[PDB]
Amino acid sequence: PQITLWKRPLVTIKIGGQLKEALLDTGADDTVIEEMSLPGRWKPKMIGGVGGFIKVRQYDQIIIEIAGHKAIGTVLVGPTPVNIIGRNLLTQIGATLNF
Amino acid sequence: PQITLWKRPLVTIKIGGQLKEALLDTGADDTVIEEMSLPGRWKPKMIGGVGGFIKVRQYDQIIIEIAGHKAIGTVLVGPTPVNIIGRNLLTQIGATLNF
Ligand SMILES: CC(C)CN(C[C@@H](O)[C@H](Cc1ccccc1)NC(=O)O[C@H]1CCOC1)S(=O)(=O)c1ccc(N)cc1
Ligand SMILES: [Cl-]
Ligand SMILES: [Cl-]
Ligand SMILES: [Cl-]
Ligand SMILES: [Cl-]
Ligand SMILES: [Cl-]
Ligand SMILES: [Cl-]
Ligand SMILES: [Cl-]
Ligand code: NA
Ligand code: NA
Ligand code: NA
Numbered sequence: 001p002q003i004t005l006w007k008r009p010l011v012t013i014k015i016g017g018q019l020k021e022a023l024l025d026t027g028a029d030d031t032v033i034e035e036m037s038l039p040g041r042w043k044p045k046m047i048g049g050v051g052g053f054i055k056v057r058q059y060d061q062i063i064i065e066i067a068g069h070k071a072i073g074t075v076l077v078g079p080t081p082v083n084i085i086g087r088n089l090l091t092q093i094g095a096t097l098n099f
Numbered sequence: 100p101q102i103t104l105w106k107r108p109l110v111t112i113k114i115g116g117q118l119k120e121a122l123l124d125t126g127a128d129d130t131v132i133e134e135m136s137l138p139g140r141w142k143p144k145m146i147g148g149v150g151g152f153i154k155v156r157q158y159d160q161i162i163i164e165i166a167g168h169k170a171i172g173t174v175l176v177g178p179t180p181v182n183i184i185g186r187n188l189l190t191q192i193g194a195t196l197n198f
Contacts, residue, residue, distance in 0.1 A: 049149025
């Protein structure tokens with residue numbers, strides 16, 4: 001699709017068999033989602049946003065569908081205001097910015 | 100242009116006579132720039148994200164040049180860690196996300 005930006009670019013994602021809403025975020029290096037159960041081990045990560053840096057859990061090689069496109073990659077879990085799809089998965093689904 | 104997302108989508112902007120680097124950020128509702136002077140009236144605002152909230156000054160009807168493209172709209176000014184061009188001005192330059 002071609003998504004304009006008059007509204008927030010919210011899509012449906014599927015992770016762990018669950019549908020969730022997430023924001024496509026070109027300003028996010030990383031994908032971060034609200035607290036949920038993911039398989040496997042995690043590693044610690046600090047991520048920086050507008051208000052400062054916070055600790056999240058990093059799970060690697062997680063299967064995730066984004067707007068119907070499949071991806072397998074790193075998902076961070078932590079106290080984010082919204083589910084965010086960042087550049088690490090936007091690249092896998094072939095997203096670009098155009099103007 | 101078509102901008103891939105392998106690295107941060109940074110562009111040059113001109114605002115208030117000044118050249119700055121800024122992030123094209125589909126996850127940002129509005130544009131927020133590091134501390135600088137702008138002409139006219141302003142009012143305080145809080146904006147929030149990962150890590151919490153910051154206080155900014157809201158200036159309306161400000162012209163920016165974004166990668167060569169002029170727009171006008173609200174610009175927030177405050178202690179953001181990165182200059183961000185948000186949706187309020189991305190729409191005006193016709194930016195879309197494509198995949
Ligand atoms: C969190 C989203 C919903 C909103 N933010 C935009 C995001 O793109 C934000 C931009 C940014 C990049 C680098 C450092 C600081 C900020 N990236 C972000 O936090 O990256 C994290 C999440 C995972 O990857 C790392 S905002 O900055 O809080 C914000 C809020 C309101 C307005 N009007 C403008 C901006
Ligand atoms: Cl949800
Ligand atoms: Cl869960
Ligand atoms: Cl969708
Ligand atoms: Cl990844
Ligand atoms: Cl503050
Ligand atoms: Cl505006
Ligand atoms: Cl349009
Ligand atoms: Na868990
Ligand atoms: Na894993
Ligand atoms: Na004004």
